[PDB]
Amino acid sequence: SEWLTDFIIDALDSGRFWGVGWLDEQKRIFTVPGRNRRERMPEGFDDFYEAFLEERRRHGLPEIPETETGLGCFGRLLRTANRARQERPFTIYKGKMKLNRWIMT
């Protein structure tokens, strides 16, 4: 699961994904969108979790069950691979939008 570290870092530094940025580049603290408080995506940006699922196909991973979403899977894989973790606060807001806050390991 090296590709996951890579995918996250490339996504963050590209600035391309709605809700996906650093809060502390030195401490490696970053955000992904929350399931919950959603804002419509601007013109310039791409869907982070969509891209995540695509990347997962690229590494020959099985399609996620119909009971699952890219967001769930992303969190889970970050955890089982111990590649980032969460502390309170688990979330932060940008306007209306809930962001899930993470600390890379």
mmCIF file of all heavy atoms in Angstrom, residues 23-66:
data_model
loop_
_atom_site.group_PDB
_atom_site.id
_atom_site.type_symbol
_atom_site.label_atom_id
_atom_site.label_comp_id
_atom_site.label_asym_id
_atom_site.label_seq_id
_atom_site.Cartn_x
_atom_site.Cartn_y
_atom_site.Cartn_z
ATOM 1 N N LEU A 23 -3.234 21.316 6.315
ATOM 2 C CA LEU A 23 -3.473 22.313 7.351
ATOM 3 C C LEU A 23 -2.133 22.604 8.034
ATOM 4 O O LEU A 23 -1.882 23.718 8.507
ATOM 5 C CB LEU A 23 -4.486 21.789 8.368
ATOM 6 C CG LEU A 23 -5.874 21.378 7.885
ATOM 7 C CD1 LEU A 23 -6.671 20.794 9.057
ATOM 8 C CD2 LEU A 23 -6.590 22.563 7.265
ATOM 9 N N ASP A 24 -1.280 21.583 8.071
ATOM 10 C CA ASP A 24 0.084 21.714 8.561
ATOM 11 C C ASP A 24 0.994 20.791 7.731
ATOM 12 O O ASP A 24 1.055 19.570 7.968
ATOM 13 C CB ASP A 24 0.155 21.345 10.037
ATOM 14 C CG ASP A 24 1.467 21.751 10.686
ATOM 15 O OD1 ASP A 24 2.552 21.556 10.086
ATOM 16 O OD2 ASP A 24 1.403 22.258 11.825
ATOM 17 N N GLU A 25 1.697 21.374 6.760
ATOM 18 C CA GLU A 25 2.551 20.595 5.871
ATOM 19 C C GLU A 25 3.707 19.904 6.613
ATOM 20 O O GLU A 25 4.088 18.778 6.271
ATOM 21 C CB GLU A 25 3.080 21.471 4.734
ATOM 22 C CG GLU A 25 1.980 22.097 3.880
ATOM 23 C CD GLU A 25 2.531 22.904 2.719
ATOM 24 O OE1 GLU A 25 3.742 22.740 2.407
ATOM 25 O OE2 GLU A 25 1.751 23.689 2.115
ATOM 26 N N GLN A 26 4.270 20.575 7.620
ATOM 27 C CA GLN A 26 5.356 19.987 8.390
ATOM 28 C C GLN A 26 4.850 18.834 9.228
ATOM 29 O O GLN A 26 5.451 17.762 9.212
ATOM 30 C CB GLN A 26 6.049 21.015 9.285
ATOM 31 C CG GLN A 26 7.162 21.807 8.600
ATOM 32 C CD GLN A 26 6.633 23.077 7.954
ATOM 33 O OE1 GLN A 26 5.413 23.285 7.884
ATOM 34 N NE2 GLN A 26 7.545 23.939 7.476
ATOM 35 N N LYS A 27 3.753 19.043 9.961
ATOM 36 C CA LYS A 27 3.184 17.966 10.772
ATOM 37 C C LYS A 27 2.440 16.921 9.932
ATOM 38 O O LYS A 27 1.965 15.909 10.473
ATOM 39 C CB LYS A 27 2.250 18.517 11.861
ATOM 40 C CG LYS A 27 2.939 19.312 12.978
ATOM 41 C CD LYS A 27 1.924 19.888 13.972
ATOM 42 C CE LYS A 27 2.565 20.926 14.906
ATOM 43 N NZ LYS A 27 3.444 20.306 15.935
ATOM 44 N N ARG A 28 2.341 17.155 8.623
ATOM 45 C CA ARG A 28 1.574 16.266 7.735
ATOM 46 C C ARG A 28 0.079 16.154 8.121
ATOM 47 O O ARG A 28 -0.493 15.063 8.093
ATOM 48 C CB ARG A 28 2.201 14.864 7.691
ATOM 49 C CG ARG A 28 3.603 14.795 7.080
ATOM 50 C CD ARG A 28 3.511 15.020 5.589
ATOM 51 N NE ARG A 28 4.533 14.300 4.824
ATOM 52 C CZ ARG A 28 5.635 14.863 4.329
ATOM 53 N NH1 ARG A 28 5.877 16.163 4.541
ATOM 54 N NH2 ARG A 28 6.495 14.117 3.633
ATOM 55 N N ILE A 29 -0.551 17.274 8.469
ATOM 56 C CA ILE A 29 -1.973 17.266 8.791
ATOM 57 C C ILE A 29 -2.778 17.734 7.574
ATOM 58 O O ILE A 29 -2.535 18.819 7.042
ATOM 59 C CB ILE A 29 -2.297 18.116 10.045
ATOM 60 C CG1 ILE A 29 -1.457 17.647 11.251
ATOM 61 C CG2 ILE A 29 -3.789 18.035 10.373
ATOM 62 C CD1 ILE A 29 -1.358 18.667 12.398
ATOM 63 N N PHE A 30 -3.726 16.912 7.129
ATOM 64 C CA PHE A 30 -4.444 17.201 5.892
ATOM 65 C C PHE A 30 -5.953 16.957 6.025
ATOM 66 O O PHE A 30 -6.412 16.483 7.054
ATOM 67 C CB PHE A 30 -3.868 16.395 4.720
ATOM 68 C CG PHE A 30 -4.059 14.895 4.840
ATOM 69 C CD1 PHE A 30 -5.123 14.263 4.212
ATOM 70 C CD2 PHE A 30 -3.144 14.108 5.549
ATOM 71 C CE1 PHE A 30 -5.294 12.873 4.304
ATOM 72 C CE2 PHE A 30 -3.309 12.725 5.637
ATOM 73 C CZ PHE A 30 -4.391 12.112 5.011
ATOM 74 N N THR A 31 -6.716 17.282 4.984
ATOM 75 C CA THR A 31 -8.162 17.075 5.001
ATOM 76 C C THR A 31 -8.677 16.282 3.787
ATOM 77 O O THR A 31 -8.082 16.319 2.703
ATOM 78 C CB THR A 31 -8.951 18.416 5.127
ATOM 79 O OG1 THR A 31 -8.532 19.339 4.106
ATOM 80 C CG2 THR A 31 -8.734 19.056 6.498
ATOM 81 N N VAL A 32 -9.777 15.555 3.997
ATOM 82 C CA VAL A 32 -10.555 14.934 2.913
ATOM 83 C C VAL A 32 -12.020 15.325 3.164
ATOM 84 O O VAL A 32 -12.348 15.731 4.269
ATOM 85 C CB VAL A 32 -10.343 13.389 2.864
ATOM 86 C CG1 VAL A 32 -8.887 13.081 2.500
ATOM 87 C CG2 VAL A 32 -10.707 12.726 4.209
ATOM 88 N N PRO A 33 -12.905 15.258 2.150
ATOM 89 C CA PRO A 33 -14.258 15.741 2.494
ATOM 90 C C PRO A 33 -15.016 14.810 3.456
ATOM 91 O O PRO A 33 -14.814 13.585 3.421
ATOM 92 C CB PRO A 33 -14.973 15.770 1.131
ATOM 93 C CG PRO A 33 -13.840 15.755 0.083
ATOM 94 C CD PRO A 33 -12.783 14.913 0.718
ATOM 95 N N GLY A 34 -15.870 15.382 4.304
ATOM 96 C CA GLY A 34 -16.727 14.584 5.170
ATOM 97 C C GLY A 34 -17.859 13.937 4.389
ATOM 98 O O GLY A 34 -18.158 14.346 3.255
ATOM 99 N N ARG A 35 -18.491 12.914 4.969
ATOM 100 C CA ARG A 35 -19.610 12.246 4.284
ATOM 101 C C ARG A 35 -20.771 13.209 4.256
ATOM 102 O O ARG A 35 -21.571 13.265 3.313
ATOM 103 C CB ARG A 35 -20.014 10.970 5.031
ATOM 104 C CG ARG A 35 -21.294 10.327 4.544
ATOM 105 C CD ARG A 35 -21.594 9.065 5.327
ATOM 106 N NE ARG A 35 -20.405 8.243 5.523
ATOM 107 C CZ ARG A 35 -20.004 7.270 4.703
ATOM 108 N NH1 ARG A 35 -20.694 6.973 3.596
ATOM 109 N NH2 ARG A 35 -18.903 6.585 4.991
ATOM 110 N N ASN A 36 -20.775 14.028 5.291
ATOM 111 C CA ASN A 36 -21.951 14.710 5.757
ATOM 112 C C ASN A 36 -22.198 16.092 5.152
ATOM 113 O O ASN A 36 -23.033 16.221 4.274
ATOM 114 C CB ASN A 36 -21.912 14.765 7.288
ATOM 115 C CG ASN A 36 -23.206 15.167 7.840
ATOM 116 O OD1 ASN A 36 -24.198 15.159 7.118
ATOM 117 N ND2 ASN A 36 -23.241 15.536 9.110
ATOM 118 N N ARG A 37 -21.512 17.127 5.610
ATOM 119 C CA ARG A 37 -21.945 18.506 5.294
ATOM 120 C C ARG A 37 -21.415 18.978 3.930
ATOM 121 O O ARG A 37 -20.379 19.652 3.846
ATOM 122 C CB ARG A 37 -21.477 19.482 6.387
ATOM 123 C CG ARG A 37 -21.940 19.132 7.807
ATOM 124 C CD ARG A 37 -23.361 19.605 8.058
ATOM 125 N NE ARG A 37 -23.899 19.109 9.318
ATOM 126 C CZ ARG A 37 -25.183 19.211 9.674
ATOM 127 N NH1 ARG A 37 -26.054 19.810 8.864
ATOM 128 N NH2 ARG A 37 -25.597 18.726 10.841
ATOM 129 N N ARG A 38 -22.121 18.655 2.856
ATOM 130 C CA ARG A 38 -21.511 18.814 1.532
ATOM 131 C C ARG A 38 -21.781 20.144 0.806
ATOM 132 O O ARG A 38 -22.886 20.696 0.882
ATOM 133 C CB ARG A 38 -21.874 17.621 0.660
ATOM 134 C CG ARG A 38 -21.544 16.308 1.354
ATOM 135 C CD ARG A 38 -21.833 15.102 0.471
ATOM 136 N NE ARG A 38 -23.263 14.817 0.377
ATOM 137 C CZ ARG A 38 -23.792 13.883 -0.415
ATOM 138 N NH1 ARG A 38 -23.000 13.142 -1.187
ATOM 139 N NH2 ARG A 38 -25.112 13.687 -0.438
ATOM 140 N N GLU A 39 -20.745 20.662 0.142
ATOM 141 C CA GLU A 39 -20.876 21.792 -0.779
ATOM 142 C C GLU A 39 -20.678 21.283 -2.198
ATOM 143 O O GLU A 39 -19.814 20.425 -2.454
ATOM 144 C CB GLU A 39 -19.825 22.884 -0.526
ATOM 145 C CG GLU A 39 -19.953 23.613 0.782
ATOM 146 C CD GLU A 39 -20.434 25.050 0.630
ATOM 147 O OE1 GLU A 39 -21.406 25.276 -0.140
ATOM 148 O OE2 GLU A 39 -19.841 25.941 1.315
ATOM 149 N N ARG A 40 -21.467 21.833 -3.115
ATOM 150 C CA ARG A 40 -21.276 21.615 -4.535
ATOM 151 C C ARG A 40 -19.821 21.907 -4.934
ATOM 152 O O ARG A 40 -19.186 22.843 -4.432
ATOM 153 C CB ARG A 40 -22.231 22.525 -5.296
ATOM 154 C CG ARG A 40 -22.526 22.092 -6.712
ATOM 155 C CD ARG A 40 -23.876 22.641 -7.173
ATOM 156 N NE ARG A 40 -24.241 22.090 -8.473
ATOM 157 C CZ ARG A 40 -23.929 22.653 -9.638
ATOM 158 N NH1 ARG A 40 -23.258 23.801 -9.666
ATOM 159 N NH2 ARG A 40 -24.292 22.074 -10.779
ATOM 160 N N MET A 41 -19.293 21.082 -5.827
ATOM 161 C CA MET A 41 -17.918 21.213 -6.299
ATOM 162 C C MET A 41 -17.786 22.314 -7.373
ATOM 163 O O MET A 41 -18.535 22.322 -8.364
ATOM 164 C CB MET A 41 -17.471 19.850 -6.837
ATOM 165 C CG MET A 41 -16.076 19.766 -7.431
ATOM 166 S SD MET A 41 -15.696 17.885 -7.860
ATOM 167 C CE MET A 41 -16.390 17.837 -9.710
ATOM 168 N N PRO A 42 -16.848 23.260 -7.173
ATOM 169 C CA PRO A 42 -16.522 24.304 -8.163
ATOM 170 C C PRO A 42 -16.062 23.726 -9.507
ATOM 171 O O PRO A 42 -15.799 22.520 -9.591
ATOM 172 C CB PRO A 42 -15.365 25.064 -7.505
ATOM 173 C CG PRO A 42 -15.577 24.872 -6.018
ATOM 174 C CD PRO A 42 -16.158 23.478 -5.885
ATOM 175 N N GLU A 43 -15.957 24.579 -10.530
ATOM 176 C CA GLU A 43 -15.577 24.156 -11.888
ATOM 177 C C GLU A 43 -14.183 23.505 -12.000
ATOM 178 O O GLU A 43 -14.020 22.451 -12.633
ATOM 179 C CB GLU A 43 -15.636 25.352 -12.853
ATOM 180 C CG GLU A 43 -16.851 26.276 -12.703
ATOM 181 C CD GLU A 43 -18.139 25.687 -13.280
ATOM 182 O OE1 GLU A 43 -18.088 24.588 -13.881
ATOM 183 O OE2 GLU A 43 -19.206 26.329 -13.125
ATOM 184 N N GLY A 44 -13.181 24.139 -11.395
ATOM 185 C CA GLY A 44 -11.809 23.668 -11.511
ATOM 186 C C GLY A 44 -11.471 22.325 -10.872
ATOM 187 O O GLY A 44 -10.523 21.664 -11.294
ATOM 188 N N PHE A 45 -12.241 21.913 -9.867
ATOM 189 C CA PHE A 45 -11.878 20.770 -9.025
ATOM 190 C C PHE A 45 -12.458 19.414 -9.454
ATOM 191 O O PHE A 45 -13.485 19.360 -10.138
ATOM 192 C CB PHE A 45 -12.285 21.053 -7.584
ATOM 193 C CG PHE A 45 -11.625 22.267 -7.000
ATOM 194 C CD1 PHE A 45 -12.247 23.502 -7.068
ATOM 195 C CD2 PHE A 45 -10.379 22.168 -6.378
ATOM 196 C CE1 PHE A 45 -11.653 24.615 -6.532
ATOM 197 C CE2 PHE A 45 -9.768 23.285 -5.836
ATOM 198 C CZ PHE A 45 -10.408 24.512 -5.916
ATOM 199 N N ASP A 46 -11.800 18.327 -9.036
ATOM 200 C CA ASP A 46 -12.267 16.961 -9.305
ATOM 201 C C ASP A 46 -12.727 16.245 -8.023
ATOM 202 O O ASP A 46 -12.380 16.659 -6.904
ATOM 203 C CB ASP A 46 -11.162 16.125 -9.963
ATOM 204 C CG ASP A 46 -10.611 16.759 -11.232
ATOM 205 O OD1 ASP A 46 -10.935 17.929 -11.509
ATOM 206 O OD2 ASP A 46 -9.833 16.088 -11.947
ATOM 207 N N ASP A 47 -13.499 15.171 -8.194
ATOM 208 C CA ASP A 47 -14.015 14.389 -7.076
ATOM 209 C C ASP A 47 -12.915 13.486 -6.476
ATOM 210 O O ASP A 47 -12.459 12.533 -7.108
ATOM 211 C CB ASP A 47 -15.189 13.534 -7.562
ATOM 212 C CG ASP A 47 -15.955 12.873 -6.427
ATOM 213 O OD1 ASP A 47 -15.336 12.392 -5.449
ATOM 214 O OD2 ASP A 47 -17.201 12.834 -6.518
ATOM 215 N N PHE A 48 -12.524 13.770 -5.239
ATOM 216 C CA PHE A 48 -11.449 13.029 -4.588
ATOM 217 C C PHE A 48 -11.684 11.513 -4.485
ATOM 218 O O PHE A 48 -10.796 10.717 -4.831
ATOM 219 C CB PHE A 48 -11.153 13.611 -3.200
ATOM 220 C CG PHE A 48 -10.091 12.848 -2.447
ATOM 221 C CD1 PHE A 48 -8.742 13.008 -2.765
ATOM 222 C CD2 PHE A 48 -10.444 11.947 -1.439
ATOM 223 C CE1 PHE A 48 -7.753 12.287 -2.088
ATOM 224 C CE2 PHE A 48 -9.473 11.230 -0.750
ATOM 225 C CZ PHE A 48 -8.114 11.399 -1.077
ATOM 226 N N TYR A 49 -12.867 11.125 -3.998
ATOM 227 C CA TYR A 49 -13.161 9.718 -3.715
ATOM 228 C C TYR A 49 -13.391 8.908 -4.980
ATOM 229 O O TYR A 49 -13.028 7.725 -5.063
ATOM 230 C CB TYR A 49 -14.352 9.593 -2.748
ATOM 231 C CG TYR A 49 -14.039 10.104 -1.355
ATOM 232 C CD1 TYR A 49 -14.724 11.193 -0.815
ATOM 233 C CD2 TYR A 49 -13.054 9.497 -0.581
ATOM 234 C CE1 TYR A 49 -14.432 11.670 0.461
ATOM 235 C CE2 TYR A 49 -12.753 9.962 0.685
ATOM 236 C CZ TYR A 49 -13.442 11.048 1.201
ATOM 237 O OH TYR A 49 -13.138 11.486 2.471
ATOM 238 N N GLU A 50 -14.000 9.547 -5.965
ATOM 239 C CA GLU A 50 -14.059 8.988 -7.316
ATOM 240 C C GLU A 50 -12.650 8.632 -7.820
ATOM 241 O O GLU A 50 -12.354 7.471 -8.159
ATOM 242 C CB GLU A 50 -14.748 9.983 -8.256
ATOM 243 C CG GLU A 50 -14.800 9.569 -9.711
ATOM 244 C CD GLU A 50 -15.560 8.260 -9.942
ATOM 245 O OE1 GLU A 50 -16.189 7.745 -8.979
ATOM 246 O OE2 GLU A 50 -15.524 7.746 -11.098
ATOM 247 N N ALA A 51 -11.770 9.629 -7.823
ATOM 248 C CA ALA A 51 -10.369 9.416 -8.179
ATOM 249 C C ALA A 51 -9.696 8.279 -7.361
ATOM 250 O O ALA A 51 -8.905 7.488 -7.909
ATOM 251 C CB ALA A 51 -9.594 10.729 -8.041
ATOM 252 N N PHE A 52 -10.020 8.208 -6.061
ATOM 253 C CA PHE A 52 -9.504 7.175 -5.172
ATOM 254 C C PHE A 52 -9.878 5.784 -5.627
ATOM 255 O O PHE A 52 -9.040 4.865 -5.626
ATOM 256 C CB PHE A 52 -10.033 7.366 -3.755
ATOM 257 C CG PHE A 52 -9.711 6.219 -2.836
ATOM 258 C CD1 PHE A 52 -8.381 5.943 -2.476
ATOM 259 C CD2 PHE A 52 -10.727 5.410 -2.328
ATOM 260 C CE1 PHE A 52 -8.063 4.865 -1.620
ATOM 261 C CE2 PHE A 52 -10.430 4.333 -1.473
ATOM 262 C CZ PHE A 52 -9.093 4.057 -1.119
ATOM 263 N N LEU A 53 -11.155 5.633 -5.978
ATOM 264 C CA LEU A 53 -11.680 4.359 -6.429
ATOM 265 C C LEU A 53 -11.025 3.946 -7.748
ATOM 266 O O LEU A 53 -10.637 2.764 -7.926
ATOM 267 C CB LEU A 53 -13.201 4.429 -6.563
ATOM 268 C CG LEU A 53 -13.988 4.496 -5.246
ATOM 269 C CD1 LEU A 53 -15.470 4.471 -5.516
ATOM 270 C CD2 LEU A 53 -13.609 3.357 -4.309
ATOM 271 N N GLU A 54 -10.883 4.917 -8.659
ATOM 272 C CA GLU A 54 -10.148 4.685 -9.912
ATOM 273 C C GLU A 54 -8.724 4.163 -9.646
ATOM 274 O O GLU A 54 -8.322 3.096 -10.139
ATOM 275 C CB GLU A 54 -10.121 5.965 -10.766
ATOM 276 C CG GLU A 54 -11.035 5.919 -12.003
ATOM 277 C CD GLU A 54 -11.817 7.218 -12.245
ATOM 278 O OE1 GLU A 54 -11.296 8.314 -11.932
ATOM 279 O OE2 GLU A 54 -12.959 7.145 -12.762
ATOM 280 N N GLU A 55 -7.971 4.912 -8.849
ATOM 281 C CA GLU A 55 -6.637 4.494 -8.431
ATOM 282 C C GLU A 55 -6.624 3.074 -7.850
ATOM 283 O O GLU A 55 -5.688 2.305 -8.086
ATOM 284 C CB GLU A 55 -6.053 5.504 -7.428
ATOM 285 C CG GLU A 55 -4.587 5.263 -7.062
ATOM 286 C CD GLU A 55 -3.603 5.507 -8.217
ATOM 287 O OE1 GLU A 55 -4.039 5.755 -9.368
ATOM 288 O OE2 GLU A 55 -2.374 5.453 -7.964
ATOM 289 N N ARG A 56 -7.669 2.729 -7.098
ATOM 290 C CA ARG A 56 -7.776 1.383 -6.546
ATOM 291 C C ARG A 56 -7.925 0.342 -7.661
ATOM 292 O O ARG A 56 -7.358 -0.746 -7.561
ATOM 293 C CB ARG A 56 -8.927 1.289 -5.547
ATOM 294 C CG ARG A 56 -8.478 1.157 -4.085
ATOM 295 C CD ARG A 56 -9.685 0.944 -3.160
ATOM 296 N NE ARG A 56 -10.725 0.207 -3.871
ATOM 297 C CZ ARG A 56 -10.994 -1.086 -3.715
ATOM 298 N NH1 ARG A 56 -10.331 -1.821 -2.832
ATOM 299 N NH2 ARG A 56 -11.947 -1.641 -4.447
ATOM 300 N N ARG A 57 -8.671 0.675 -8.717
ATOM 301 C CA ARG A 57 -8.754 -0.205 -9.900
ATOM 302 C C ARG A 57 -7.397 -0.405 -10.567
ATOM 303 O O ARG A 57 -7.017 -1.545 -10.894
ATOM 304 C CB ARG A 57 -9.739 0.325 -10.936
ATOM 305 C CG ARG A 57 -11.148 0.320 -10.444
ATOM 306 C CD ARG A 57 -12.145 0.679 -11.511
ATOM 307 N NE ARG A 57 -13.453 0.816 -10.885
ATOM 308 C CZ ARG A 57 -13.954 1.969 -10.454
ATOM 309 N NH1 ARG A 57 -13.267 3.095 -10.620
ATOM 310 N NH2 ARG A 57 -15.152 2.002 -9.877
ATOM 311 N N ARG A 58 -6.672 0.700 -10.766
ATOM 312 C CA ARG A 58 -5.290 0.631 -11.277
ATOM 313 C C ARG A 58 -4.385 -0.376 -10.546
ATOM 314 O O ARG A 58 -3.538 -0.998 -11.170
ATOM 315 C CB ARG A 58 -4.638 2.023 -11.337
ATOM 316 C CG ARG A 58 -5.249 2.908 -12.423
ATOM 317 C CD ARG A 58 -4.695 4.333 -12.454
ATOM 318 N NE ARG A 58 -5.541 5.215 -13.270
ATOM 319 C CZ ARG A 58 -5.453 5.344 -14.599
ATOM 320 N NH1 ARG A 58 -4.545 4.659 -15.297
ATOM 321 N NH2 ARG A 58 -6.280 6.165 -15.239
ATOM 322 N N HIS A 59 -4.566 -0.569 -9.247
ATOM 323 C CA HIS A 59 -3.765 -1.577 -8.553
ATOM 324 C C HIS A 59 -4.507 -2.894 -8.390
ATOM 325 O O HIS A 59 -4.267 -3.633 -7.435
ATOM 326 C CB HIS A 59 -3.246 -1.054 -7.208
ATOM 327 C CG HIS A 59 -2.348 0.135 -7.341
ATOM 328 N ND1 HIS A 59 -2.827 1.403 -7.607
ATOM 329 C CD2 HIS A 59 -1.001 0.253 -7.267
ATOM 330 C CE1 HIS A 59 -1.816 2.250 -7.681
ATOM 331 N NE2 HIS A 59 -0.695 1.574 -7.480
ATOM 332 N N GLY A 60 -5.409 -3.184 -9.325
ATOM 333 C CA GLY A 60 -6.059 -4.483 -9.380
ATOM 334 C C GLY A 60 -6.889 -4.880 -8.169
ATOM 335 O O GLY A 60 -7.107 -6.070 -7.919
ATOM 336 N N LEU A 61 -7.354 -3.893 -7.411
ATOM 337 C CA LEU A 61 -8.202 -4.172 -6.254
ATOM 338 C C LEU A 61 -9.658 -4.434 -6.679
ATOM 339 O O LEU A 61 -10.159 -3.833 -7.644
ATOM 340 C CB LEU A 61 -8.099 -3.046 -5.214
ATOM 341 C CG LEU A 61 -6.719 -2.943 -4.553
ATOM 342 C CD1 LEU A 61 -6.690 -1.877 -3.456
ATOM 343 C CD2 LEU A 61 -6.270 -4.293 -4.000
ATOM 344 N N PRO A 62 -10.340 -5.344 -5.962
ATOM 345 C CA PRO A 62 -11.725 -5.699 -6.303
ATOM 346 C C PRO A 62 -12.650 -4.508 -6.116
ATOM 347 O O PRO A 62 -12.411 -3.710 -5.208
ATOM 348 C CB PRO A 62 -12.082 -6.774 -5.270
ATOM 349 C CG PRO A 62 -10.779 -7.190 -4.644
ATOM 350 C CD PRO A 62 -9.881 -6.008 -4.729
ATOM 351 N N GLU A 63 -13.675 -4.385 -6.956
ATOM 352 C CA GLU A 63 -14.674 -3.335 -6.774
ATOM 353 C C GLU A 63 -15.250 -3.381 -5.353
ATOM 354 O O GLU A 63 -15.412 -4.456 -4.775
ATOM 355 C CB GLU A 63 -15.798 -3.461 -7.808
ATOM 356 C CG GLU A 63 -15.342 -3.263 -9.244
ATOM 357 C CD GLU A 63 -14.624 -1.947 -9.442
ATOM 358 O OE1 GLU A 63 -15.257 -0.888 -9.234
ATOM 359 O OE2 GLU A 63 -13.425 -1.972 -9.795
ATOM 360 N N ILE A 64 -15.528 -2.208 -4.787
ATOM 361 C CA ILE A 64 -16.111 -2.130 -3.451
ATOM 362 C C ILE A 64 -17.583 -2.587 -3.483
ATOM 363 O O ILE A 64 -18.302 -2.325 -4.465
ATOM 364 C CB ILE A 64 -15.960 -0.705 -2.839
ATOM 365 C CG1 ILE A 64 -16.801 0.330 -3.589
ATOM 366 C CG2 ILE A 64 -14.486 -0.269 -2.827
ATOM 367 C CD1 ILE A 64 -16.892 1.661 -2.853
ATOM 368 N N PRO A 65 -18.029 -3.288 -2.424
ATOM 369 C CA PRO A 65 -19.392 -3.828 -2.306
ATOM 370 C C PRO A 65 -20.431 -2.738 -2.529
ATOM 371 O O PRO A 65 -20.081 -1.563 -2.394
ATOM 372 C CB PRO A 65 -19.455 -4.259 -0.848
ATOM 373 C CG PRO A 65 -18.060 -4.559 -0.473
ATOM 374 C CD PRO A 65 -17.199 -3.609 -1.249
ATOM 375 N N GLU A 66 -21.677 -3.094 -2.837
ATOM 376 C CA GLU A 66 -22.712 -2.068 -3.015
ATOM 377 C C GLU A 66 -23.063 -1.392 -1.690
ATOM 378 O O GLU A 66 -23.681 -0.325 -1.691
ATOM 379 C CB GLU A 66 -23.982 -2.652 -3.630
ATOM 380 C CG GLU A 66 -24.566 -3.777 -2.776
ATOM 381 C CD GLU A 66 -26.024 -4.083 -3.079
ATOM 382 O OE1 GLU A 66 -26.712 -3.220 -3.674
ATOM 383 O OE2 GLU A 66 -26.479 -5.192 -2.711
#
